[PDB]
Structure formats: C-alpha cells, structure tokens
Amino acid sequence: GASKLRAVLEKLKLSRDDISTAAGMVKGVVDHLLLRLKCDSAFRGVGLLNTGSYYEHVKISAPNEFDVMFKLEVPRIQLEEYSNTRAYYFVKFKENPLSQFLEGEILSASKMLSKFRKIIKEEINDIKDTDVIMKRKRGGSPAVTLLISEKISVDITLALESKSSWPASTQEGLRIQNWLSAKVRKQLRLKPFYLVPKHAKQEETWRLSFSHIEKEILNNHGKSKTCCENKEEKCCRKDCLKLMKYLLEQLKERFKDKKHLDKFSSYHVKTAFFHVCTQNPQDSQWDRKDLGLCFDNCVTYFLQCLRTEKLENYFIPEFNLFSSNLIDKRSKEFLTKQIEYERNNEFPVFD
C-alpha cells in the first residue's frame, strides 16, 4: 500500500516546487499593504510573522491559496480569561497608539478590524496594475481575503504580539519534553505569544495563536539534531502530516454540498499529529520504510479522538477541540465512517 502513498506524495511535490509567478505577485501586494499600514499611528509597528516567507499554505491540495499573518506588538498588555474558556481572553492595558480602539477597559477587536479592513480596501484601489478584489466575510480571523488576477487568493490575519510569559492555561501544555527535550520546551516558551480576533459564543474576545511554534516544531522534528540530514536518519514524520492534511482536504471537497465537515480543519489534524509524535518520541518509530504502518497509526489515533469525543489542545490541555459543545456527534460519526471506508479501500479519494 505504501507505493500508493509515495505516489500521492510524488504528485503533491510536482505542483509545489514548479515555476510560478504567483509567489512574487503575492509578495508585491503584501509589501504594498504593509507600507500603507505603517503610515497609521495605531498600525505603526506592523509586519509579517515570518519575514522572507510569505508563501505559507493551510491547503496542500490548493497551491494558489496563500495564508499570511500581520503581527503588531502590544506592550503594557494585561489579559482577563473569558468565561473559564481557557483560550479566549479580553485585552486590557496599563494614552496608547490603539487608544482609538478602547471600549471601557476592553480593546475593541471589531473597531480594530474595521480600521484594518478600511485601509486595505483603499490600498487595493491604488493598484491599477493587477485586479485585486477584497472579499468580506464573518469569523474574526482570517480578517480579510484578497483575490489577485484570478484564482490566486491570500488570507491576511491581524495578530497582537506579547513579549511576556505565556498565560497560566499553557502551564501543562506543549508536552515535548520526552521528544524534542526540556531545554527546547524552556526556549520556545521564552518566545512571544500571539492573539487573533476570535468570537466565542457580542463579546470582543481574542484567542491564543501558536502558528510560530508549530512551524518551529515541524522544521526541527526529530529527537536527533541530524534527523533527515542523512541516509541513516530518514524519517516519515512530515509525510505523515502531509497525507493526513491531504485526506481531510479531499473528503471536505467531496462533501462540500453537505455541512458535516465544515467544522473540521487542518488544525484538528496538526493537534492530533503532535499528540502521536509525543506518544512515539523516538526517530526509530518513524523510519521511512514504515510509512504505511506510521500513517495507519496516525489515522487510528485521529479516529479514536472522533469516537471518544476527546482531542486536547496541544498548548492549552483543558481545552477539548472535539467536545459536543463545539462539534456535534453526528458530524464526527460522518467523518469516522468516511475515513474508515477510505482506509479499508486503500484511499480512493487520493486517486
């Protein structure tokens, strides 16, 4: 079966590294937006989360779809935990550039997104080169989506940066100690945390964002410092993640007409994969000759999470991604049925 898996990985590589003028058209549009935003006293300290890398995708089956984050440093920050949710907070301070966005003691996520969208939609009209259009949708983050030329899309998210100790909810999270080490857990937690506008079921809440840590773990994934740097040390961690992302993206497209899978995203997949990496910390548990075995095990864990209705957040342990108060049993049982059929028929959806 692994020869079908490696064929799927071979086809996914042929669309990645290919010659595309889109990755430069995206960078040119981003730089335009970022320069205009810096003119405003509120958005003066704005810039990309990972500079040099605009080319970031949530979707592995949609190369034309890009996803960027615009970070802004919020000093003198003070958080207040919304309704014992563990993940959702209000933003309070300690005259400030964003004083124009305050409502009582709480920072308006709506009025901040408002000025943010306003500026962008004006910067698009000042581009008579390419036909950029601003799509407006509800959900907090992604804040805005741009369509360059045709069928080339960029999702821009606004994130507040706090160069201070991560919230008390994260104390027992990121259990990488027996895999990536205690030294690494200490280092990563010394990095800043990001907050994106996100509505909790109105309330002007901000949610914790760990996108920078995710990329950090994925680009240095072995117990060995030289994992995947030589022939003797070749693992299948990344290919296992790639395939799980591709399976959920394919099933989501298959049943776009129904509404059962709308609630599932690559984040449920990545959270589940990191729990597997923790459970199997050795590089010898991910040898490249075991791709079929390793992936089936990844599929099995994700399935156990759907059936038991338990998927702990990788960063905030008391937060369950699969609780009944977020995703209904019927939707999880539909996703279980589809994955079980695919696995039993050696993944036809991959084709």
Residue 181, both tokens: 């080490």
At 320, list the tokens. Answer: 């369950």
Is 209 labelled a binding residue? Answer: yes
Neighbours of 311 (CB within 10 A): 23
Whose Cβ is closer to Zn ion: residue 172's or residue 229's? Answer: 229
Residue 222 interacting entry, from ligand YQQ, Zn ion, none, C-beta within 5 to 8 Å by type = Zn ion
Cis status, amide bond into 142, omega within 30 of 0: yes
Count the Cβ atoms, other than its own, within 10 Å of residue 32.
Answer: 17
Contact (Cβ atoms closer than 8 angstroms) between residue 70 and residue 42: no
The binder of Zn ion chosen from 148, 222, 251, 268 (CB under 5 A): 222
Q: Which two tokens stand for residue 311?
A: 């998927």
Binding status of residue 264 toward ligand YQQ by CB under 6 A? no
Closest separation in Å from C-beta 143 to ligand YQQ? 11
Tracing tokens 């773990």 back to the chain, one arrives at 217
* Beta carbon of residue 118, minimum distance to ligand YQQ (angstroms, whole number): 22
| Site residues (CB under 6 A) for ligand YQQ, limited to 205-224 | 207-211, 214
Pair 32, 148: CB distance under 8 Å: no
Whether residue 258 is annotated as binding a ligand: the answer is no
Which among Zn ion, ligand YQQ, none contacts residue 27 (Cβ within 5 to 8 A by kind)? none
Q: Closest distance between Zn ion and the C-beta of residue 74, in Å? A: 36
Nearest alpha carbon to residue 173 among 148, 146, 210? 210
Question: Residue 28 half-sphere exposure, CB side, CA atoms within 13 Å?
Answer: 11
Comparison of 60 and 235: residue with beta carbon closer to Zn ion: 235
Does residue 313 bind ligand YQQ (CB under 6 A)? yes
Confirm or reject binding of residue 270 to ligand YQQ (CB under 6 A): yes
Residue 235 binds what, of ligand YQQ, Zn ion, none (CB under 5 to 8 Å, by partner type)?
A: Zn ion
Contacted by 227, from ligand YQQ, Zn ion, none: CB < 5 to 8 Å by type: Zn ion
Q: Is 344 left (phi over 0), alpha (psi -120 to 50) or beta?
A: alpha
The answer to whether the beta carbons of residues 184 and 97 sit under 8 Å apart is no
Binding marks (x or -) toward Zn ion, 228..257, rule CB under 5 A?
x------x----------------------
Q: Which is nearer to ligand YQQ, 273 or 295 (CB)?
A: 273
Q: Which of 30, 87, 156, 158 binds ligand YQQ (CB under 6 A)?
A: 87
Q: What residues form DSSP beta bridges with 79?
A: 91
Distance, CA of 262 to CA of 251 (rounded, Å): 11
Q: Does 227 carry a binding-site annotation? A: yes
Q: Where are the alpha helices (DSSP H) in the chain?
A: 2-13, 22-37, 109-125, 182-188, 211-218, 237-254, 266-279, 291-308, 329-344
Binding residue numbers for GTP: 51, 155, 207-214
Binding residue numbers: 51, 53, 65-67, 155, 198, 207-214, 221, 227-228, 235, 245, 266-270
User: Which residue ranges make up the site for Zn ion (CB under 5 A)?
Assistant: 222, 227-228, 235
User: Which residue ranges make up the site for ligand YQQ (CB under 6 A)?
Assistant: 87, 141, 207-211, 214, 265, 267, 270-271, 313-316, 319
